Structures are given as C-alpha cells and as structure tokens.
Design an enzyme around this catalytic site. Sequence first.
Site, PDB file in Angstrom:
ATOM      1  N   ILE A   1      47.919  46.595  28.761  1.00  0.00           N
ATOM      2  CA  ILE A   1      46.977  46.475  27.632  1.00  0.00           C
ATOM      3  C   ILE A   1      45.783  45.528  27.888  1.00  0.00           C
ATOM      4  CG2 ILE A   1      48.664  47.277  25.946  1.00  0.00           C
ATOM      5  CD1 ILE A   1      49.124  44.315  25.127  1.00  0.00           C
TER       6      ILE A   1
ATOM      7  N   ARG B   1      43.372  43.550  31.483  1.00  0.00           N
ATOM      8  CA  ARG B   1      43.150  43.116  32.867  1.00  0.00           C
ATOM      9  C   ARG B   1      42.201  41.925  32.791  1.00  0.00           C
ATOM     10  NH1 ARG B   1      46.244  45.992  36.361  1.00  0.00           N
ATOM     11  NH2 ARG B   1      45.103  47.928  35.872  1.00  0.00           N
ATOM     12  N   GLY B   2      42.501  40.893  33.577  1.00  0.00           N
ATOM     13  CA  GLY B   2      41.659  39.706  33.730  1.00  0.00           C
ATOM     14  C   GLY B   2      41.505  39.326  35.186  1.00  0.00           C
ATOM     15  N   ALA B   3      40.804  38.216  35.414  1.00  0.00           N
ATOM     16  CA  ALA B   3      40.403  37.805  36.766  1.00  0.00           C
ATOM     17  C   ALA B   3      41.579  37.566  37.717  1.00  0.00           C
ATOM     18  CB  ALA B   3      39.508  36.566  36.700  1.00  0.00           C
TER      19      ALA B   3
ATOM     20  N   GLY C   1      45.024  38.496  37.065  1.00  0.00           N
ATOM     21  CA  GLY C   1      46.191  39.289  36.701  1.00  0.00           C
ATOM     22  C   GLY C   1      45.945  40.269  35.573  1.00  0.00           C
ATOM     23  N   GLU C   2      47.017  40.600  34.851  1.00  0.00           N
ATOM     24  CA  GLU C   2      47.013  41.641  33.811  1.00  0.00           C
ATOM     25  C   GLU C   2      47.874  41.253  32.623  1.00  0.00           C
ATOM     26  OE1 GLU C   2      49.997  45.045  34.918  1.00  0.00           O
ATOM     27  OE2 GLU C   2      48.794  44.756  36.731  1.00  0.00           O
TER      28      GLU C   2
ATOM     29  N   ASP D   1      34.458  29.982  24.969  1.00  0.00           N
ATOM     30  CA  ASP D   1      34.409  31.425  25.201  1.00  0.00           C
ATOM     31  C   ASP D   1      34.896  32.162  23.942  1.00  0.00           C
ATOM     32  OD1 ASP D   1      33.725  33.718  26.856  1.00  0.00           O
ATOM     33  OD2 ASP D   1      35.826  33.925  27.376  1.00  0.00           O
TER      34      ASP D   1
ATOM     35  N   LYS E   1      34.429  34.888  21.326  1.00  0.00           N
ATOM     36  CA  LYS E   1      33.842  36.233  21.265  1.00  0.00           C
ATOM     37  C   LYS E   1      34.884  37.190  20.645  1.00  0.00           C
ATOM     38  CE  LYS E   1      35.007  37.051  26.137  1.00  0.00           C
ATOM     39  NZ  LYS E   1      34.352  37.382  27.449  1.00  0.00           N
TER      40      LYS E   1
ATOM     41  N   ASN F   1      38.378  37.965  22.234  1.00  0.00           N
ATOM     42  CA  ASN F   1      39.368  36.899  22.073  1.00  0.00           C
ATOM     43  C   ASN F   1      39.810  36.643  20.627  1.00  0.00           C
ATOM     44  OD1 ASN F   1      38.909  36.702  24.854  1.00  0.00           O
ATOM     45  ND2 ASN F   1      37.588  34.910  24.659  1.00  0.00           N
TER      46      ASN F   1
HETATM   47  C1  LIG Z   1      42.550  34.632  34.341  1.00  0.00           C
HETATM   48  O1  LIG Z   1      43.391  35.775  34.513  1.00  0.00           O
HETATM   49  C2  LIG Z   1      43.656  36.610  33.471  1.00  0.00           C
HETATM   50  C3  LIG Z   1      44.608  37.597  33.640  1.00  0.00           C
HETATM   51  C4  LIG Z   1      44.908  38.462  32.614  1.00  0.00           C
HETATM   52  C5  LIG Z   1      44.262  38.354  31.405  1.00  0.00           C
HETATM   53  C6  LIG Z   1      43.313  37.374  31.225  1.00  0.00           C
HETATM   54  C7  LIG Z   1      42.592  37.243  29.915  1.00  0.00           C
HETATM   55  C8  LIG Z   1      41.170  37.767  30.086  1.00  0.00           C
HETATM   56  N1  LIG Z   1      43.272  38.022  28.882  1.00  0.00           N
HETATM   57  C9  LIG Z   1      44.051  37.412  27.973  1.00  0.00           C
HETATM   58  O2  LIG Z   1      44.208  36.220  28.006  1.00  0.00           O
HETATM   59  C10 LIG Z   1      44.748  38.208  26.918  1.00  0.00           C
HETATM   60  C11 LIG Z   1      46.232  37.886  27.000  1.00  0.00           C
HETATM   61  C12 LIG Z   1      46.964  38.751  25.985  1.00  0.00           C
HETATM   62  C13 LIG Z   1      46.486  38.374  24.590  1.00  0.00           C
HETATM   63  C14 LIG Z   1      47.230  39.215  23.596  1.00  0.00           C
HETATM   64  C15 LIG Z   1      48.220  38.664  22.810  1.00  0.00           C
HETATM   65  C16 LIG Z   1      48.888  39.459  21.909  1.00  0.00           C
HETATM   66  N2  LIG Z   1      48.587  40.727  21.795  1.00  0.00           N
HETATM   67  C17 LIG Z   1      47.652  41.286  22.526  1.00  0.00           C
HETATM   68  C18 LIG Z   1      46.945  40.554  23.450  1.00  0.00           C
HETATM   69  C19 LIG Z   1      44.986  38.641  24.486  1.00  0.00           C
HETATM   70  C20 LIG Z   1      44.241  37.817  25.536  1.00  0.00           C
HETATM   71  C21 LIG Z   1      43.009  36.509  32.251  1.00  0.00           C
END
Ligand SMILES: COc1cccc([C@@H](C)NC(=O)[C@H]2CC[C@H](c3ccncc3)CC2)c1
Lengths: 374, 389
Positions: free
Chosen positions: A75, A77-79, A81-82, A191, A193, A196
Amino acid sequence: ASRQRKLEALIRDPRSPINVESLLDGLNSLVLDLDFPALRKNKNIDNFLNRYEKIVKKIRGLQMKAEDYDVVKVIGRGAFGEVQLVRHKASQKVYAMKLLSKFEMIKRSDSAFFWEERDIMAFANSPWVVQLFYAFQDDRYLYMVMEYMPGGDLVNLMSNYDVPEKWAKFYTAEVVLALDAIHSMGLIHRDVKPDNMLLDKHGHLKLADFGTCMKMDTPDYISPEVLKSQGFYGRECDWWSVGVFLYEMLVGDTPFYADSLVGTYSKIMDHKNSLCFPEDAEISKHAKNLICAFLTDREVRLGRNGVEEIRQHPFFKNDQWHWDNIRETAAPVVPELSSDIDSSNFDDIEDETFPIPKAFVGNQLPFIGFTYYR
Amino acid sequence: ASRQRKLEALIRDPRSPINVESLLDGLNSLVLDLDFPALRKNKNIDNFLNRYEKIVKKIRGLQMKAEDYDVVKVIGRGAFGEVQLVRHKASQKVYAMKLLSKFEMIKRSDSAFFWEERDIMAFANSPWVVQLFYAFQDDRYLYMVMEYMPGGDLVNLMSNYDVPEKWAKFYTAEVVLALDAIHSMGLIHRDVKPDNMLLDKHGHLKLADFGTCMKMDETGMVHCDTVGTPDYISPEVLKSQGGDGFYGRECDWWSVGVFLYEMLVGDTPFYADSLVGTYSKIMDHKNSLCFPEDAEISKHAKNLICAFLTDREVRLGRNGVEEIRQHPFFKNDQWHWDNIRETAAPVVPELSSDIDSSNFDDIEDVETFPIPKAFVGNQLPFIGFTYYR
Ligand SMILES: COc1cccc([C@@H](C)NC(=O)[C@H]2CC[C@H](c3ccncc3)CC2)c1
Ligand SMILES: COc1cccc([C@@H](C)NC(=O)[C@H]2CC[C@H](c3ccncc3)CC2)c1
Ligand SMILES: [Cl-]
C-alpha cells in the site's frame, strides 16, 4: 538495595535505552555482526558464539518476526522500503507494516530518523497520531506495525471529491489539532502535506510518516525559510503547509504550481505577489484571510504566537463542531468498506544485502534498541 | 502470550545465559571492546558509543564494584590472581574476595574454568560448599565475593596440631560428605587436597576452590585438562594427561586416601624432593605405599587408606558412597553421618575480631591489554559472569 532499585527501574522503563528489549537487541546484533567464518578465526569470538549459539536461536524463534504476518498487499513505497497491509496469523488482526532496508540506510548515510518516528507513534497516546503496536527487526529490515487507516489519505479524497468549504473547515481544523499535539511533544514535522494525512475507519484525520521529524531546541508544500536555509527554523514552517493545504482543498490546484520545480521554487519565494485566488474559485473572505495569514514570512506568520490565535480565527466558526469535541462529531466522508483488508482508498503499487565482512564492521549497532512490544 | 511467557521465564531465571545481569554484561563488554579512538573511525561504532555514553556511565556507578570494598589483607595467591579479606563499606560485613586477572587468562589460553566455580558456589545451596554472594567485574578483573572461612585450611591445622585418629575420623568423614554433595551435583573436583578444605567459624569443613571442576557425562566420566601439586593426584589422572585418557568420581576418592594418610602419618605417602620423584612413586603405588613403623595408626585406618590407594577398577567409592560410610574406621561414639556437621568440631576457632586472619599465613603492579588497532573482543569471554544474590 537502593543502587539495585535504581538499576531495576532503569530496566523496567519502556523509554529506557537499557530496557529488556534493547539489551536483547544488543545480544542479537552482536551475534549477527560476529557470526561469519573469518571472524571466528579469533578465539574470543568463536568461544563467545559457541556459548550463545543455541539460546540466540531460541530467542529468534520466540521473538516477533515477519513470518508471523501474511502480506495481503503493498500500500506504499518510500525511499528506504515499503508499506505492507498485513494480517497477524495467530490473532487474525490487520495492521499496516512499514519496512526499512538496513543496507540502504547505512549506504545512504541516513540511519537515525526512525528513532523519533518510532517514539512518536509508540508514546504520543494521542488520537491524532497513528499508533505503533510493535517495532521489531531481522538482519535485513526494521519493521513498524501500526494501526491500519482504511480511509486513505487526503490526496485520495481531494482527487475523488470537489471539497466544499464546510469540509475544508473540518479537515483543516483536525490538521491544526494534530500539529498542535506534535508541537506539544517538542517536535517540528517539516513535511506536512495531504500524503501524510490519513483518515481512519470513521473518516477522521491522523498524521503518519514522521521520517522528517526533528526535536526542537515535495516542493509544493515547502516554506520559503526552509528553501533559503538549504540544510535554522521553527514550528511556523508547519503552519505554512496548512496554508498550502487549505488552498489546495478549496481551489483544487497548488498555490505556487509550475511545470518545472524551479518555477515552483521561484513562485514560493515571491509569495507576496504570486499568491493569487482565481476569479472562478468558490472561496469565502474568511478562507482567503486564513490562507493569506499562513502564507507569509515566518516573522509575522499565524501560529508563531501559539495555536490559540489559529483557533479564534472566524473561518473556523460553524454550527457542527467545537474544538474540544471535533473528533467525536460526524466526519464529512465516512468510508464505505467491504472488509478488514479493503484497500480501495489506496492506489495500486508496482515495483541487495551487506557483504560478508573480513573483520568486525558493526552494521547492526545502529539498530540496537529499536525493538518495542506494546 | 505463550511465546512471550517462555521468553520472560528465560530472562527471570538466575541460571540463564540471558538473565538481566548477563545482558548488561553484553552491553558493558561491547562498549569496553569498542571505545578506542582508532575503532571510532567507523561511523557505526562512533554513533553507537555516543548513544550509549551516558547510560553506561550511569550503570557503572550503580553496579557493584571493587571500590565498594576496603581491602584489609591478602590471604591467598593463585595462578591468575589473589585472595583479599575485604569489608563491604555500606553494610560493614566481611567477605573473602577472589580476583582473577583477565589479561593472564587470555594470555595463558585459560578463560573457561571460572564458570563451574561460580555456579558451584552460587547454586549448590549446601553447607559443605563455600557460598558466593556476589560475582562482578571491571575491565581488568573478575571478582568473587564469598563467605569468609576464619578457621583457615587443613594445611594450617595439620602444621599446628599432631592430629589424633578421632580428629582424622571427623575431618575425613566431613570430606566424604562434601565430595558426595559435589558428586550428586554431576561434578568431579580433580584437585581435592587440604589447601582446598576450609574450616568455618565453628570449625567445620567446607570445600573451596573449584577451578579444576568438570561436569560429568551421562556415564559419570570426564575429559582431560589442566596440573601441578602432584602429591594428591591419582595415577589415572597422571596417565590421562599425557594422552587423551578418561576418568570418573573415583579419582577424588584417591585424594581422600592421600588426605587421611597425611593426617595420621604427618607426611605425604608418595613424598619426594623432586616432583618427578613424586610422580614416579604415585605410579608405583602397589610397591611404594608403605606405612612407617613409628607411625601411630590403627588397622582400620590402614585398611581404608589402602582401599582408596589402589587402581581405579577396584577402588572404594566406585560403587557409591554407601560402602565408604559403612567402613569400620568411621565407627565412633561422638557423631552420626546425618548429624556430623551439627556436633562439636575438634577445633573451634577463638577469633579476636571479624577481621582476624591469624589462621591464614602472611603474604607479600599488573599489566593490561594493549590499545588495540581493530576489534579483538577481550571482554567477550566474561559476558554472563555477573551474579547478584
Ligand atoms: C524512508 O523509507 C520509507 C519507506 C516506506 C515508506 C516511507 C514513507 C514515505 N511512508 C510512510 O511512512 C507511510 C507508512 C504507513 C502509514 C500508514 C499507516 C496506516 N495506514 C496506512 C498507512 C502512512 C505513511 C518511507
Ligand atoms: C587460578 O587463579 C586463582 C586466583 C586466586 C586464587 C586461586 C586459588 C589458589 N585460591 C582459591 O581458590 C581460594 C579462593 C578463596 C577461598 C576462601 C574462601 C573463604 N575464606 C578464605 C578463602 C579459598 C580458595 C586461584
Ligand atoms: Cl557412624
């Protein structure tokens, strides 16, 4: 007795660097960093590992791990991981699990940000912050198990509905109280937005993604001080982003939009002149006032002198909710969900280890103390 | 829940390698092994140490240490350390503290023996074994705080009195029950001698010094190691250390044979000027064992000694302790086997204070690990040594 009672309290404390989970992380990490054939040529290392071979295997079995969870869908993807929608196998309960690659964090000189992220979600005890139930780790990853937010984010909402001002009032009011909670904890977000800002099962806001959180002493939403600084700045930079959020919700475009990033950067710096409400935009005088109050130079920006002056602004006057009960009134958009794994409000997503070292390098030392059990 | 209850039990257990004290030893040891300027050129190491700088200082303050004790006198010296009569400053209570040099143990390839010694003294819960109250460590030493035996050892007693057979009966009987307790715990001593037999405030025996203790197999047998002080070693233990021989609990019963001979005769049965002469006499025991014609010793006492000082295959105590207990030598009007330690000892020490070390003979700088160029792990051997009663 007295010195022993102080030491036992330090270990009991869930906030402590020497809690039981941290001390176990120390043992595991040490075994992982040491257990390689070339290092066992050292008698000190080989003997130590023989002693702790079986028991560390038995801890690894007993402790929480990724194999305790079925991956349902990706659900996010980030820098580093996922994000996985997961179901814990025994309890059958559903969580959102965030993975962080240890290799990439070390490779890209960025292996401290997760501490504040873990602490905020674990210890805030706040309805405006996504709760963390479990933090654990393997040799390759950090995992953060969190309450799943099936309503999805404000990007998703904005693309699916033309947001009327009654709704924007509500979401902006909920963002104001979420940020006030973060700020009360001694933290700037940096950050803020729609990406988030997530909606729970009842359509109410919580903040997620605290990777850019700092403890106090995308360019569309960045403030001009944060542009000029290029690295000092305060809580006011988050209030800029609420200015940009409310503009995006009512207008439907970003206030400093351009084709290039440099065009956006140039518009943001020229905000006195470039902020311009389109003549076809359905927006009130009070809503234009609040946006303009946020989208100023830091020195005179709204929220510089506390949250109270944001709360008494006339824009937020309404018949539906008060500030002290907003989160217990009916949200604008209740999500209609078909199951505990319904990820319809999240967009579909489509997609190396440490080398075997010659001597001790300590790749697991950065992650000692990350494990937390609620 | 169930997996969490198993993990919590493993940590609660004072016997566990992952008790809270062990896990703290892991943290301390790691910090000590890593905190050197050349290693901090690694970002992983430097950042880790910055994170754990304050809290490890706070643990070092809170945890037990050598500065909590006043050294009163040195009462022993050993291969890897010394023995200090100490007073704990806060409680004002007196203990016997044994120190062990970490450098020497590592330098001389001998850093495992202390585990069984610590465990025996900590966990035996037995009146025949010296109690350990505290085990702790600094960067240079392991410390073992135990109850102080102000009566001193059987070497001291033997040099101060001509031991009559009624006394020898008593001390030998107390050694038999002490060894039976050690053997019941799954352990062979391998170095039973008067030096290692101490007398409490009431003049009753306890065994001390378990540095040569080994855990037996499922068939009651044990692997070769260590020996020095040849007088009391048995011929199987002599033949084994050349090769890779095997031996059992019977080797301790040889030493009781030698003890009783020393008490009644006043010399060791296989005495010589050189150690090689002693070794040669012990191996030739069928011919070299000889009671001197001027020695005041009974027929029953000669029988028991001779029963112990034989080849392992037919030695007394091979078929359990019971056949030692029913031997006629041990018949007497003063004590039974089940109440011996609660009857009046031959020699109750008259002591003038809690620091009286008159029953211990008088005794009269050290080197550390070098500053290493890379990780060497000098503290890894000693993780899990700390025990708080
Ligand atoms: C820095 O490496 C990252 C690796 C993966 C994700 C992210 C960053 C951009 N992504 C996140 O933090 C999400 C985490 C899940 C959260 C969520 C909670 C509950 N329900 C649905 C989503 C929403 C933020 C950074
Ligand atoms: C192998 O490195 C050693 C370092 C120091 C001493 C020793 C060996 C020779 N010494 C010992 O084990 C002592 C320990 C104190 C005991 C005691 C208990 C209670 N009161 C008085 C003494 C008596 C045995 C070995
Ligand atoms: Cl009897």
